[model samples]
Target: GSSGSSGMANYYEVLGVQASASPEDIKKAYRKLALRWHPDKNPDNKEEAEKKFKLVSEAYEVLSDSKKRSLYDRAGCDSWRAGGGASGPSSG
Candidate 1:
């Protein structure tokens, strides 16, 4: 199914924030982690941090944008999966 587990992102969990989290709360968490785990900041240890940073950024990017968040809440990330979205381990 398009709604199956792997195709979607739980944006709130992506940032380790709550579904009910305030913008301030989300901002605070993003700010803290963005600095700490930023690829630019991590340099030598940047690979994992880069992945984490993208997750954090993607989280904020979705949740922070009202339209995107609304689309996500209603249509779901898996909606993206509906149009042949990749869900399997083999990305290509």
Candidate 2:
């Protein structure tokens, strides 16, 4: 995540799904967006598309996992983003 205002957007926004969406809905939304923004399919704008693909992939990874997603919703992403999650500190 980016710093300041850019950092706070919800993961659901990245997947273009409502927060109340079900798991199946989240998967469908992620699949649609991922297919559209995947790097191989968007060579014309590979760099930008790759970034979106990665972000969406990450959002799915977290949202698809019950524990991580729950922790994210309750504790927020800042700590995870700031400390590189439970692993260690991140360079970026």
Candidate 3:
């Protein structure tokens, strides 16, 4: 039984940006949230901050890319992750 409601976190909401936000807007939001939730800045609540920081990074990683964003828009978060969108290739 496949339920359509996956209850996934909305990347747009994670970065506090709208779905129609441009690259600049996305970057701005990501930078702001990244700084606010950075683990180093939240020593007392490092665990929680680390979690949010990772979410912010994940949101930005997909939203910052045209192809990934397109696929994420068309498919749900689970689908995107299942299709190998969760990890990106590392380049030295």
Candidate 4:
């Protein structure tokens, strides 16, 4: 997250979905998102680019797995960050 007021926005809320939405729902969410923020579509909007980056990452982060998604579904992204997410790039 970006910190301060900018960080307060919910990724799923921004992506337009509910917490209980399924994997297919998440994929559909990303598809709508990709269309909105696609570089070609946005035509050089840096702010839009960044928002898309975070949303795309956030969507993938939850949609990629059952456990992670469940954790996120229950607690939101703050808990994921509290659990040591996004500290740095992984050594792997």
lDDT per prediction?
Answer: 0.76, 0.78, 0.83, 0.68
**Over 4 Å off in model 3, which ranges?**
1-7, 76-92
lDDT of 1 by residue, 9-77 (tens): 587877787767788888889989888888888768879888778788877878888888777777644
Candidate 2 lDDT tens digits, 9-47: 578778887656788988888888888998889868888
Cα error, candidate 3, residue 92 (Å):
49
C-alpha lDDT (0 to 100) for residue 46 of candidate 1: 74
lDDT score, candidate 1, position 15: 79
Tell me the deviation in Å of residue 31 in model 1: 0.7
Better TM-score candidate (1, 2) = 2
Question: What are the per-model numbers of colliding residue pairs?
Answer: 0, 0, 0, 0
On a 0 to 1 TM-score scale, where does candidate 4 land against the true structure?
A: 0.57
Q: Identify the superior model by TM-score, candidate 1 or candidate 3.
A: 3
The window of 10 residues in a row where model 3 has the poorest summed lDDT is 77-86
Cα error of candidate 1 at position 14, Å: 1.4
Number of the candidate with higher lDDT, 1 or 3: 3
Rank list by TM-score:
3, 2, 1, 4
Sequence-dependent TM-score of model 3: 0.70
TM-score of each: 0.63, 0.67, 0.70, 0.57
